[PDB]
Write a protein that binds this ligand. Structure first.
Ligand SMILES: Nc1ncnc2c1ncn2[C@@H]1O[C@H](COP(=O)(O)OP(=O)(O)OP(=O)(O)O)[C@@H](O)[C@H]1O
Ligand SMILES: Nc1ncnc2c1ncn2[C@@H]1O[C@H](COP(=O)(O)OP(=O)(O)OP(=O)(O)O)[C@@H](O)[C@H]1O
Ligand SMILES: Nc1ncnc2c1ncn2[C@@H]1O[C@H](COP(=O)(O)OP(=O)(O)OP(=O)(O)O)[C@@H](O)[C@H]1O
Ligand SMILES: Nc1ncnc2c1ncn2[C@@H]1O[C@H](COP(=O)(O)OP(=O)(O)OP(=O)(O)O)[C@@H](O)[C@H]1O
Ligand SMILES: Nc1ncnc2c1ncn2[C@@H]1O[C@H](COP(=O)(O)OP(=O)(O)OP(=O)(O)O)[C@@H](O)[C@H]1O
Ligand SMILES: Nc1ncnc2c1ncn2[C@@H]1O[C@H](COP(=O)(O)OP(=O)(O)OP(=O)(O)O)[C@@H](O)[C@H]1O
Ligand SMILES: Nc1ncnc2c1ncn2[C@@H]1O[C@H](COP(=O)(O)OP(=O)(O)OP(=O)(O)O)[C@@H](O)[C@H]1O
Ligand SMILES: Nc1ncnc2c1ncn2[C@@H]1O[C@H](COP(=O)(O)OP(=O)(O)OP(=O)(O)O)[C@@H](O)[C@H]1O
Ligand SMILES: Nc1ncnc2c1ncn2[C@H]1C[C@H](O)[C@@H](COP(=O)(O)OP(=O)(O)OP(=O)(O)O)O1
Ligand SMILES: Nc1ncnc2c1ncn2[C@H]1C[C@H](O)[C@@H](COP(=O)(O)OP(=O)(O)OP(=O)(O)O)O1
Ligand SMILES: Nc1ncnc2c1ncn2[C@H]1C[C@H](O)[C@@H](COP(=O)(O)OP(=O)(O)OP(=O)(O)O)O1
Ligand SMILES: Nc1ncnc2c1ncn2[C@H]1C[C@H](O)[C@@H](COP(=O)(O)OP(=O)(O)OP(=O)(O)O)O1
Ligand SMILES: Nc1ncnc2c1ncn2[C@H]1C[C@H](O)[C@@H](COP(=O)(O)OP(=O)(O)OP(=O)(O)O)O1
Ligand SMILES: Nc1ncnc2c1ncn2[C@H]1C[C@H](O)[C@@H](COP(=O)(O)OP(=O)(O)OP(=O)(O)O)O1
Ligand SMILES: Nc1ncnc2c1ncn2[C@H]1C[C@H](O)[C@@H](COP(=O)(O)OP(=O)(O)OP(=O)(O)O)O1
Ligand SMILES: Nc1ncnc2c1ncn2[C@H]1C[C@H](O)[C@@H](COP(=O)(O)OP(=O)(O)OP(=O)(O)O)O1
Ligand SMILES: [Zn+2]
Ligand SMILES: [Zn+2]
Ligand SMILES: [Zn+2]
Ligand SMILES: [Zn+2]
Ligand SMILES: [Zn+2]
Ligand SMILES: [Zn+2]
Ligand SMILES: [Zn+2]
Ligand SMILES: [Zn+2]
Lengths: 147, 147, 147, 147, 147, 147, 147, 147
C-alpha cells in the first residue's frame, strides 16, 4: 500500500495481527522510500443485500437520503440526519455481519428515527414496511404510543 | 407583433409548431424591417403563486414528482400518476383563475390522489400539510374514514 | 390550441388583437367541443445570448442557482432567492428585448443582490465579473461602500 | 480474519487488488469452514469529524469540489486543483492524527490555495469562514497583504 | 427449490415482491441447510429468437424504442406508444407460443401501428423490412391503400 | 401474478411443483377474470459476485460489451457477439450456482471466444487476466498454440 | 494564445490581417518563451438557429447522427456517413452566414443524401419535413423520380 | 471582420474570453452597421484527415479515450493518460503540418504510450493496426524487445 508519507508504489507488511473478535486485521508496514512506518486497519466491506438479492456496498448516504425523504418540511436539520445515519451505521457494524439485508438496515433506522421525528418515522415506516392501508398506519401509531 | 429588436408593427410568422401536450404553440416570426427571426410561444398562462410569493408557470412535472414521492412503494404505475397530473392540470386550468396559489394546486391534487391511493394521500397530506405530531395523522385518518 | 375546458385537438381563433407596446398578442378562441371561450396571451420567448453566442431560453432557475451558489452559508432563505429570481426576470422582461446577453442578466442580478446579501454579492461579482486579483475585490468593496 | 458469517479464526486471501491512488487494498478471502467469499478493504483510516460531530472517511472529491467551486471563473486547470487536493491529503495523513476535524481539513486546503489563486482563496475563505460582512473580507485581505 | 449452493430439497420463501407491470414475482428464499438467502424470479418466459438465432427475454422497452424512432416528428404521445407496446406484449404472450422469432414481434407491432400512425408505419416498415428501393415504399403504400 | 390474458391484479396458484434438479419451480395459476390458466417458471436470479464482492444481477449485455471491446475492428459481427453472449450465459446457468464470480464468467467467455476471434481473445485475456508484461502475452500465445 | 511549441500562458499578435471575403482573420503571433512564430486563423462560430430559436454551435455529429438514424439497415458505411456530414458542413460554411436555420441544414443534407441512399433520403425527409400522410411520401417519391 | 449578416468591413470586439487549455479565444463582436453580436473563435487549425478522408479538428478527448481503452486494467492514472494526450497534441501541433492524417496521430501516441505502459502499447497497437493473427502480436513484441 502506497505510503502516506512517501507515495511509494509498493510497500511490505512488517507486522500483521488479528484484532479482538477478528473484525479487523492490524497491519503495520514500513515504506522503502522515506522509511516511515504506517499502520493500517483491514476490515470487511459492509454489504447490504438488497431486496433483489444484490449485495451493494453499505452507504450511509442512502440511509440519510431515505430518512431525509421521510423528513420533509420537518424540524430536522442536516446535522440530525447525519447523526442518525452515523447511528445506523454504528449499529449495523456492531451487529458484526458483513452482509445485512435492507430489512435489517430499515429496522436500525426505525428505532432511533422515533427520537428524531415520530411523524417522519411514520412516513419512513409507510414506505419501508409498505403499509397497505390506513389500518397499517393506525397499527403503527398504536406501537409508537405503546412505549 | 412589434419586433423586439426594432419595434416594427408587423412581423410575419415564418413557421409555427405546436406542443402536443403543451398548450403552447412555438412560432418563428420574421420582421420585415431588420430581417431578424424571433421566437414566440403562445400559451394560456397558468401561473401559480408559490409559498414564497413568487410566480411560476404551472408545470406538470412538479405535480408528477410530488405524487411519485408520495406513492413510492405503493403500486401506482407511472401511467396512473401521469393521469393524476393531467387531471389536476385540467381541473386548475378549468377553474379559470389563471393565477392560483400552490395551495390551490395542492388541494386540486389531493382529491384525485384519495381515489388513486390512500397511503399516498396520507404521505402526500403529511408532507404538504405540516403534520407536526401523530395527532395530525389521526385527524386526517378520521377525515378519510368519514368519506 | 387545445381547450382548457374541453381538450379538443384543434381550435379556431375568434379574436386576435395587439396589446399595448406589442409585447404580446391577445388571442381569444372558441372551442368546438364544449363551446367555452378561452383567452390566451402570445408573448416572445425571452432568450439569453450566452457568452458563447448560444441563445438559450431564459430560465430564472439558472439565475436562482447562481445566486444560491453565491449565497452559501448565508442568512438568505429559499424564499429570498426565489424573490430575487422573480425580480431579475421582471427587470429583464421590462427591458423589452427578446435576447439579453448574460452580461445584462448578471447586471440585473447584481443591483438587487446587494439588498439580499452584500457578501453574497461579492462572491457573485467575483465569479461573474471574473475578478482577476484582490485589487478587483477591493474595487468592488469600494463601489459597495460608495452608495 | 474471523469469517464474518461463522467466525472461523483463519481465512485465506483468494485475491488481492490494490487501489492505485487509494491507500486501499481490496482482498477477496475464502473461509475454509463455510466456503464463502468475503471482501475486505485495507486502509489507514483518515476520518474527519464533520461540523455535525459525525465521522466520515477523508475523501479527495470533497476537497476537489470545494476548490473547484472557489476557483470557478479563475484559470485553475482541473489538474492544478487535483494537485491541491493530493497535496492536502498528503499533509493531513502526514500530521498523523488519523482523526481530524474538518476545520483542520479547511486550514490544510487554504495555505496551498493561497499559492494556487488569491481570488479563489478569498472565495474559499468567504464560504468556509462566515464572512458575515464586508469587514471580514477586508480583514482577510489585510491578512493576505501581510504575507 | 433446491438451494443453488448446497442443493437442499426444501427452501422457504422469506419474502416475495411482485413486479406491478412485470409478470415477474421476486422472492427471497432461505435454505435451512446452509442458511443463505437467494433470490428467484417467477415469470412466464416470452423468449424471442433474434435474427442472429440467439434468445432474449421479451422486453417492452425494445418495442417502445422501435416505435418511438418510427414516430419521431409524428404526434404520437409517449402514452400512446406505451399502449402500443402493452398491446403488442398482450398479443404475443396471448399467441401462447412462449418462444417466438422477432419477425413475429415485428408483425405484431405493425398492425396496431397502422391504427396509431401511417407515416410511422411506413417508417417502421421501411426500417423493419429492407425497402432497398422506392418500389418497396410504393408496394407498401399500395398495401396500405388496399386496407 | 397478473394474468397474461386478463391483466387481473391478483391470481391464485392452483399448481406448484418442483422441476428436475430443483433449478426451477413450475407454477400454473388460474386467473379470476377471464378464467384462462397460465403456467410460469420460478427460477433463481443468476448473480455475479463482482471482484469487489458486489453481487450484481447477471447480464449478458455486460459480457457482450466486454467481448465487443475486445473485438474492435475485427471480422466479428453483432450476431456473433450475441451468440457468444448466449453461449456464456448458457454455460454459466448450466453450472447451476446462483452466484458466479466474475472470474468464472471470464473463463466461460474465454474458451468459446477463441473460436470467434483468437486475436480478440488476446485483447480480452490481457484486460481480464491483467497481463503484467509481454511475458504474459507470450505465455497466452503459447497456450493458444498448445491446442 | 498559448504557443503550440512553448506552452507560454500569454503571447502577442505580431501580425493581423483580413482574409479574402473577410470570413477569417489571419493572426501570426510570436511566443516569448521559445521564440517560435505560429500562425492562427480566426473564424466565425457556425451557429445553427434551432427551430425553437436556440442558436446552438454547429456540429456535424448531429447531422451524421440524424442521417444514420435515416440510414438504418442500409448499405451505407460509417465512412459514407462521415463524408456526407463533411459535405453538409462544407456547403453550409460555403453559404457564408454565421447562423443557419435547421431548415437550411436539412436542405443541405437532403440533396447529397439522394446519392448515398434514396430510401434513407425518404426516411430523413419524412421526419425532417414532417410528412403528414402517405400523400407526402408519394409527393416525395415523385420529386426523386423527377430528376 | 466582415459581418457575416451584412458584410460590413469593420466589426468591434465587444468581448474576448480565451480557452485555458484550448488554443481558442472566443470573441463577441459588434457590427456597427446592423448592430448584431456575432461569436468568433480564434484557433490554429489542427485538422486530422480521418481514414474516411474527412477532416476533423484535432480533439484531445479522442486520444484520451483511445488511451484509456488500451489501458483498461493497467495502472495508468487518469492524470498520466491526460499527460500522454497533452504530449501528443504538443508533438503534432509542433510538427507544424496543420493538416495531418490520423495515421500520424496514431504514430504520435504510440511512442509515448511505450513509456507509459507496454501492455497498453500492445493493446493500442493491436486495435490501431490490424493484428489479424497472433503473428502480428509476436512481430510487435519482437519490435518492443529490440528497443
Ligand atoms: N446499499 C445500501 N447501503 C446502505 N443502506 C442502504 C442501501 N440500500 C438501501 N439502503 C437503505 O436501507 C433501507 C431499506 O430500504 P428498502 O428495504 O425499502 O429498500 P430496497 O431493498 O432497496 O427496496 P426496493 O428494491 O424495493 O426499492 C432504506 O433506508 C435504504 O435507504
Ligand atoms: N410550478 C408549479 N407548477 C405546478 N404545481 C406546482 C408548482 N410548484 C409546486 N406545485 C405543486 O403545488 C403544491 C405546493 O406544495 P407546497 O405548499 O408543499 O410547496 P411550495 O408552495 O412549493 O413551498 P415550498 O417552499 O415549501 O416548496 C405541491 O403539490 C406541488 O407539487
Ligand atoms: N439561459 C439562461 N437564462 C437565464 N439566466 C441565465 C441563463 N444562462 C445563464 N444565466 C444567468 O445569467 C448570469 C450570467 O452568468 P455568466 O455570464 O457568468 O454565464 P455564462 O455566459 O453562461 O458563462 P460561461 O459560458 O463562461 O460559463 C448568471 O447568473 C447565470 O446563472
Ligand atoms: N468527508 C470529507 N473528507 C475530506 N474533506 C472534507 C470532507 N467533508 C468536508 N471536507 C472539507 O473540509 C472543509 C470543511 O468545510 P466546512 O466547515 O465549511 O463544512 P462542513 O464541516 O462539512 O460543515 P457543513 O455542515 O456546513 O457542510 C471543506 O474544505 C470541505 O471540502
Ligand atoms: N428482446 C426483444 N424483446 C422484444 N421485442 C424485441 C426484442 N428485440 C427486438 N424486438 C423487436 O422485434 C422487431 C425485430 O426487428 P428486426 O428484425 O429489424 O431486428 P432484429 O431481429 O433485432 O435484428 P438486427 O440484428 O437487425 O437488430 C423490432 O420491432 C424490435 O423492436
Ligand atoms: N453483473 C454481471 N453480469 C454478467 N457479466 C458480468 C457482470 N459484471 C461483469 N461481467 C463480465 O464478466 C467478465 C469478468 O470481468 P472482470 O472480472 O474483469 O470484471 P470486474 O470484476 O467487474 O472488474 P473490475 O471491478 O476490476 O472493473 C467480463 O467479461 C465482464 O463484462
Ligand atoms: N446544432 C446543430 N448543428 C448542426 N446540425 C444540427 C444541429 N441541430 C440540428 N442539426 C441537424 O439539422 C437538421 C435539421 O433537423 P430538424 O430541423 O428536424 O431539427 P430541430 O430543429 O432540432 O427540431 P426539433 O426541435 O423539432 O426536434 C437535422 O439533420 C439535425 O440533425
Ligand atoms: N478527431 C481526432 N482528433 C485527434 N485524434 C484523433 C481524432 N480521430 C481519431 N484520432 C486518433 O487518431 C488515431 C486514429 O486511429 P484509427 O486509424 O484506428 O481510426 P480512424 O482513423 O478514426 O478510423 P476508423 O474509421 O476505423 O475509426 C487514434 O489513436 C485516434 O484516437
Ligand atoms: N417518498 C418517501 N416518503 C417517505 N419515506 C420515503 C420515501 N421514499 C423513500 N422513503 C424511505 C423509506 C424507504 O424504505 C427508504 C429508502 O427508499 P428507497 O428509494 O428504496 O431507497 P434505497 O436507498 O433503497 O434506494 P434504491 O433502492 O434505489 O437503491 O426511504
Ligand atoms: N418525501 C416525500 N414524500 C412524499 N411526498 C413528498 C415528499 N417530498 C415532497 N412531497 C410532496 C408534498 C409537496 O407538497 C410536493 C412538492 O414538494 P417540493 O419538494 O416542495 O416540490 P415543488 O413542486 O413544490 O417544487 P419547488 O417548490 O422547488 O418549485 O410533493
Ligand atoms: N462558486 C461560485 N461562487 C459564487 N458565485 C458563483 C459561483 N459559481 C457561480 N456563481 C455565480 C456567478 C456566475 O456568473 C453565476 C452563474 O454561474 P454559472 O455556473 O456560469 O451559471 P450559468 O447559469 O451561466 O451556467 P451555464 O453556463 O453552465 O449554463 O453564478
Ligand atoms: N459556492 C461556493 N463558492 C466557493 N466555495 C464554495 C462554495 N460552496 C462551497 N465552497 C467551499 C467552502 C466549503 O468549506 C467547501 C465544501 O463545502 P460543502 O458544500 O459543505 O461540501 P462538503 O465537502 O463539506 O460536503 P458535506 O458537508 O455535504 O459532506 O467548499
Ligand atoms: N431510425 C429508425 N427509424 C424508424 N424506425 C426505426 C429506426 N431504427 C430502428 N427502427 C425500428 C425498426 C426496427 O425493427 C426496430 C428495432 O430496431 P433495432 O435498432 O435493431 O433494435 P432492437 O429492438 O432490435 O434491439 P437489438 O437488436 O439490439 O436487441 O425499430
Ligand atoms: N479496452 C479493452 N480491450 C479489450 N478487452 C477489454 C477492454 N476493456 C474491457 N475488456 C474486456 C476484458 C474485461 O475483463 C471485460 C470487462 O471489462 P470491464 O470494463 O471490467 O467490464 P464489466 O462488465 O466488468 O464492467 P464494470 O466492472 O464496470 O461493471 O472486457
Ligand atoms: N427515426 C428516424 N428515422 C429517420 N430519420 C430520422 C429519425 N429521427 C431523426 N431523423 C432525421 C430527420 C431529422 O430531421 C434529423 C434530426 O433528428 P433530430 O432528432 O431532430 O436531430 P437533432 O440533431 O435536431 O436533435 P435535437 O433536436 O435533439 O438537437 O434526423
Ligand atoms: N477496445 C479497445 N481496446 C484498446 N484500444 C482501443 C479499443 N478501441 C479503440 N482503441 C484505440 C485504438 C484506436 O485507434 C483508438 C481510437 O478508436 P476509435 O474507437 O475509432 O475512436 P476515434 O478516436 O478514431 O473516433 P472516430 O473515428 O469515431 O472519430 O483507440
Ligand atoms: Zn514512506
Ligand atoms: Zn425588427
Ligand atoms: Zn372547450
Ligand atoms: Zn466462515
Ligand atoms: Zn443451501
Ligand atoms: Zn386471465
Ligand atoms: Zn513558443
Ligand atoms: Zn452587420
Amino acid at each position: 500500500m502506497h505510503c502516506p508519507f512517501c507515495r511509494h508504489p509498493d510497500s511490505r507488511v512488517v507486522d500483521s495481527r488479528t484484532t479482538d473478535d477478528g473484525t479487523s486485521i492490524r497491519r503495520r508496514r514500513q515504506c522503502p522510500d522515506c522509511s516511515r512506518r504506517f499502520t493500517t486497519v483491514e476490515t470487511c466491506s459492509l454489504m447490504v443485500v438488497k431486496r433483489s438479492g444484490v449485495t451493494e456496498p453499505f452507504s450511509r448516504t442512502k440511509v440519510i437520503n431515505g430518512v431525509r425523504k421521510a423528513c420533509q418540511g420537518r424540524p430536522v436539520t442536516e446535522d440530525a440526519l447525519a447523526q442518525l445515519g452515523q447511528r445506523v451505521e454504528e449499529a449495523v457494524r456492531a451487529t458484526g455481519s458483513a452482509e445485512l439485508t435492507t430489512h435489517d438496515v430499515g429496522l436500525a433506522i426505525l428505532g432511533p428515527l422515533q427520537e428524531l421525528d415520530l411523524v417522519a418515522y411514520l412516513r419512513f415506516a409507510s414506505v419501508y414496511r409498505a403499509f397497505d392501508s390506513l389500518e397499517d398506519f393506525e397499527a403503527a401509531i398504536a406501537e409508537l404510543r405503546e412505549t
